[PDB]
Symmetry: C4
Subunit: 332 residues, 4 copies
Amino acid sequence: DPVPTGGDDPHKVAMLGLTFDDVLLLPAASDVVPATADTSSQLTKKIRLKVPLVSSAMDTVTESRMAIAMARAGGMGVLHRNLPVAEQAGQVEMVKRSGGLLVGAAVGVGGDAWVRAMMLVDAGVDVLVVDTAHAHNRLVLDMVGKLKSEVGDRVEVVGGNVATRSAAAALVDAGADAVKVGVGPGSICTTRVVAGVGAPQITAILEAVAACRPAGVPVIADGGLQYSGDIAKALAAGASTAMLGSLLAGTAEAPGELIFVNGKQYKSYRGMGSLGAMVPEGIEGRVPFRGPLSSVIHQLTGGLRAAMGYTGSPTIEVLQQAQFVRITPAGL
Amino acid sequence: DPVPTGGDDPHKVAMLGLTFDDVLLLPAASDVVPATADTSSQLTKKIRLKVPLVSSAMDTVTESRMAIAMARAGGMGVLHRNLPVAEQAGQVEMVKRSGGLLVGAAVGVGGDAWVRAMMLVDAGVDVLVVDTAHAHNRLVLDMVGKLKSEVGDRVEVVGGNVATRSAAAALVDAGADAVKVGVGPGSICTTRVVAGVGAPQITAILEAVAACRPAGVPVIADGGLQYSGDIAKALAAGASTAMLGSLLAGTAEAPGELIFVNGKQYKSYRGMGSLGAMVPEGIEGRVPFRGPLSSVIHQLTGGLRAAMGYTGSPTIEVLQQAQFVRITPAGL
Amino acid sequence: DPVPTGGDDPHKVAMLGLTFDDVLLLPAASDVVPATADTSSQLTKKIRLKVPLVSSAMDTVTESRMAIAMARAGGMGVLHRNLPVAEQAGQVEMVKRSGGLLVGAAVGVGGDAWVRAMMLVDAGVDVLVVDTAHAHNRLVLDMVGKLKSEVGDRVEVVGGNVATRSAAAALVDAGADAVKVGVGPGSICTTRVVAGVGAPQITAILEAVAACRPAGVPVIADGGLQYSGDIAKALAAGASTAMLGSLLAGTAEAPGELIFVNGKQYKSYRGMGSLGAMVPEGIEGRVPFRGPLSSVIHQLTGGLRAAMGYTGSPTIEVLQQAQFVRITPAGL
Amino acid sequence: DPVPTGGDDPHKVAMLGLTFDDVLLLPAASDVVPATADTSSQLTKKIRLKVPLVSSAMDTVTESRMAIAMARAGGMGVLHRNLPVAEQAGQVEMVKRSGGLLVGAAVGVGGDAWVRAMMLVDAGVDVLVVDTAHAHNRLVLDMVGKLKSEVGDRVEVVGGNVATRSAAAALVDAGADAVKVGVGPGSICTTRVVAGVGAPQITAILEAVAACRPAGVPVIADGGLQYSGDIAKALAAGASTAMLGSLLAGTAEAPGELIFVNGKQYKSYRGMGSLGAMVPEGIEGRVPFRGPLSSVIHQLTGGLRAAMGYTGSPTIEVLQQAQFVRITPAGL
Ligand SMILES: O=c1[nH]cnc2c1ncn2[C@@H]1O[C@H](COP(=O)(O)O)[C@@H](O)[C@H]1O
Ligand SMILES: O=c1[nH]cnc2c1ncn2[C@@H]1O[C@H](COP(=O)(O)O)[C@@H](O)[C@H]1O
Ligand SMILES: O=c1[nH]cnc2c1ncn2[C@@H]1O[C@H](COP(=O)(O)O)[C@@H](O)[C@H]1O
Ligand SMILES: O=c1[nH]cnc2c1ncn2[C@@H]1O[C@H](COP(=O)(O)O)[C@@H](O)[C@H]1O
Ligand SMILES: Cc1n[nH]c(C)c1S(=O)(=O)Nc1ccc2c[nH]nc2c1
Ligand SMILES: Cc1n[nH]c(C)c1S(=O)(=O)Nc1ccc2c[nH]nc2c1
Ligand SMILES: Cc1n[nH]c(C)c1S(=O)(=O)Nc1ccc2c[nH]nc2c1
Ligand SMILES: Cc1n[nH]c(C)c1S(=O)(=O)Nc1ccc2c[nH]nc2c1
């Protein structure tokens, strides 16, 4: 008996991938107005933010200025790692000396990454982020495991990115405090194009949460967020926080200079895997200038608070139990 | 066992949302020609219209001129509430003194809305419309309940908007005469975008009717109507009347001045939740000038009468029992 | 238990509608080359054509010139009825006197149509076509029934259009020799838009054939044919012949003058329900000039012969037993 | 009981067709980095390539220059047959004398093709490719069978193209060393348009592999490849090698001259069934100039190596066991 899509193997095409556009949040009974909502959520197992938003570790998104402004908004910024260890560790100190704010930093795998991690820890970093494209590799799982063995008492360790239930479960057993989710959904991403590899984030979050939540490990949604509604959809899918890159790249606190071409205003926004950021799995694009960060954060949270009012969710942990309605291509 | 879209929860993604474009009306045996059709239907439990159409309570759609012309066409207009109570109540009297025509008015929740409601009732209004974005909030359900307790004998009370079966059922038990349906499908709406919250109207109507019809409570379809066919689809989905905003905003009887820019003619059409109508959940757009109201109403009903001829529906109550055929994205 | 698309009624949304773009013909074992294929098929129960194509009864498609050229190509033309009976009957004689060619003519319902039918029969017409938008009306079923009772011995009677199994079955019992299928799929059609009524033709043909074929009554596919592949898809869906309008409107043998505007060449093509052809259910559009008819027919049949080579179909009656593969929106 | 898409026959619409855009590769546990991957795979039952890529047998894609450069890159080129046998056989010798490189050549069916095949074999060709549009014809199956009987000991025989399980199974029993798959998915192809015949390649590969792999016969994916990800998707679907035409037509080693029109650079790329290549089942289009071949091959393989890193596939034979996730139209 042939499978209705080809072959005799039902599990060849495992499941159906849903993205942010595929779904909409169902309104339920509510005692919650946007004003009274509690947007506080867990970034890690130890760290709680007033705003469940994080800025991406990219050289056109998050450094000193951004990382500080993000913390003061209630969230947190993660410093990118496309620069000498000495300066990145220096930026950590600049943030921490601005009022003891929360800050994160990105590291890869290997000796260079390990050395970098130690300097960051000494610099007083709060969260180390093992930044890889495919965290289901056994090298990444070891990088997380040993880091947690050495500095796990005073520093939080986060692994990513994953897109499957098994990958997230592997990170949990590795000792990760949080599991960042997103393989391919990025705006400047071309992993889906050059490798044909990816997983629609709504399904990706749902699968990852199914492995992390039973272990009490927070999940970070990374990439593919175009609007504030996507943030609410991500958290309702089970995620605890959301990492933004495209939505913050046009802000003034973000790296890259202004672009007054065409009479309009833009800012540079490139993937960390773009040819000019070093087979290129990223592109160097532009994003419309969106003014100060605080203005953008205020409206992203505003839409989030609205969704919590529609779904009758007083807290984020309740919003994570909302229900979706599936949307047909005519939904746009 | 994993759900084919993620997670182990089958009810996480509850149902599949259908919109007007997703469906088409199936032709059946007919003794009905468009000329002999009876378009009369129930707006409320007490009030019946010759034309099952209502103009939206928006400051660019329905005031004195529109509300009068709508009644004379067989339908009814609902006065918006973005203006002093004294003037809105005055517009009610202007309509009622033009031949004892039917008129509706919109109110919110709280003290201001209650005071406004009393002035409108004293002004001789026929239908009070509790105009909210999310009527499943217990504050709205109380606003409807107490209003019906005070002036329910001489004034009809309508609650909205809902998008789910449970929400509509709550409005029925609150004592509502009619339940208006539509969360997100509006043309100038951005609730789906900023909050990620909504429900495709065909499914939204079907679910709401499943709760209202057994209680004998009429259902109003609100928003998402681009063509006259959508009106027929809405009523066939179970709705008794349809509320139009975009289709009437370009009419001469509608507020907002003419726009002769580009050598073409347009009129202002903004959502009541747009930034300039006061986190903005609406936009200020333009719609093509469509001449007098009576001309538009005549052709909307004409398409409605045609659909009643194809489906063999002599009355609207029979049209509500028509069958749909589901359309693939290649349907456009 | 709620239906996954709304309501508690599984039959509210009866079935899923497939159009020509939704499907593709599956290649099978073949002893057939395009050269050796037999494109002959049944227009009616008595009449067989060398080419299973018919030109639409429209005032911008089929009159004297077209009806003659169609017959000489192996097919047949159906004269439209937007003109005095005296002239339409005269055009029948002009065709018949050009070598005893096959010709069809369109009539409506009522006294005028009955009188028209008699003049056409006296003029030596071979096929009378009851041309209506909704042939499931009992007035149409009577028009077919009595016509077949009066002149059924020497003239073939065809009813249309239908889109459902029950409608086609009603036409068969009325005594129809052929059942024309198509409600809404027309290019210049707006029935789907103004009335929200229609049925995707692949499904429409499949349902109609399921009622006609057991009774041995040929089925005509009408409207929605953009390419020659659609012709092969229509016949493989069970149809015996296909009626073309858009594909022949740009031909020189078709009514309407040349349009040299923009430096390109077009011809007038309007629906019989367009405002200028007399609530308008049609539009007045333009189609690219495609030269002589014989050139177009030669290439439409060429693509048809190719499909018969891929599917291993020596005759049209074998092609009607081909299998489809369903195509996702990424199919385009 | 009616089938939800029409008719009473469930097998009328056999299965659902998936293309490259419909699917994405699921990331799994990996010990594989792109550097350590082994891209080697089987072109035929006897011949193994270092790079699983083949250039299409088209007069705008693969001749002497291309066929040589392809072999030196690890793959192989297949010489087209739109030229005298004397010259095509001469091009084989030019390739073989450049270091004993691997080369293929295309033949049709009949006497001319048989004579051509013998000259090619004498010219020292390694792979004969029976190039037809529909290899499920019994004439093609005989052409493959007898060729393998005459020169099967010293020359490999490949049949194509197929799109169904039964067609591929027929080629295997005919004695084919490899089965090329692809009916309709070509970029310059119009078989889907003029004949309405085709089969989405992911499903087409899956069905063909289900018949070939049990017999140990390699499968070639032909046409429909827009990106390097599609190559990884094709092989993961079960294919052993992929035939490229559009991706290599813009290369300098490809036939057709440069096109400096519009200030940009293009090259001629026409189907072998295009009107100017001799009912036309092809078109004469243009493709952007992409520089040398080696540069393109290096990046196609680079994306392939990436996908092998994400899916934990050390070898191509392991990549063939990867799992897909189905993507909704919102996936783009
Ligand atoms: O170059 C790249 N290729 C693929 N993914 C990337 C690349 N650079 C950044 N990303 C991911 O995409 C996210 C940004 O997605 P966005 O917020 O939707 O723009 C980042 O936080 C990374 O997880
Ligand atoms: O600003 C807004 N945000 C969201 N929905 C709105 C807003 N303003 C009006 N609506 C709704 O949208 C309807 C109009 O939809 P339309 O007729 O499709 O233009 C109104 O009757 C309201 O129910
Ligand atoms: O004005 C109209 N409204 C709706 N359908 C029409 C109208 N005029 C013609 N048709 C139908 O559409 C067919 C032509 O479709 P086409 O060949 O796809 O252009 C005709 O043969 C009629 O069946
Ligand atoms: O003219 C044609 N009509 C249909 N298919 C063609 C034609 N010419 C080439 N093809 C096929 O399409 C493939 C190229 O597809 P592409 O690489 O996606 O451009 C070739 O290798 C052939 O299998
Ligand atoms: C190829 C690579 N190795 N290490 C990094 C960092 C990268 S990256 O620059 O390309 N970044 C990302 C980030 C998120 C992703 C999700 N899917 N793919 C991704 C790639
Ligand atoms: C946010 C708000 N509170 N009260 C009102 C009135 C509004 S509104 O201006 O935004 N109007 C609507 C009207 C219909 C809607 C359907 N979904 N969302 C909606 C919003
Ligand atoms: C409204 C009407 N009454 N009689 C005729 C003829 C018409 S028409 O001009 O509009 N023609 C058609 C023809 C085919 C159709 C398929 N669906 N709808 C259709 C309408
Ligand atoms: C019509 C014909 N006969 N022999 C050849 C060669 C051709 S072709 O030039 O058109 N080539 C192809 C090649 C691949 C195809 C996949 N589907 N259809 C195809 C056609």
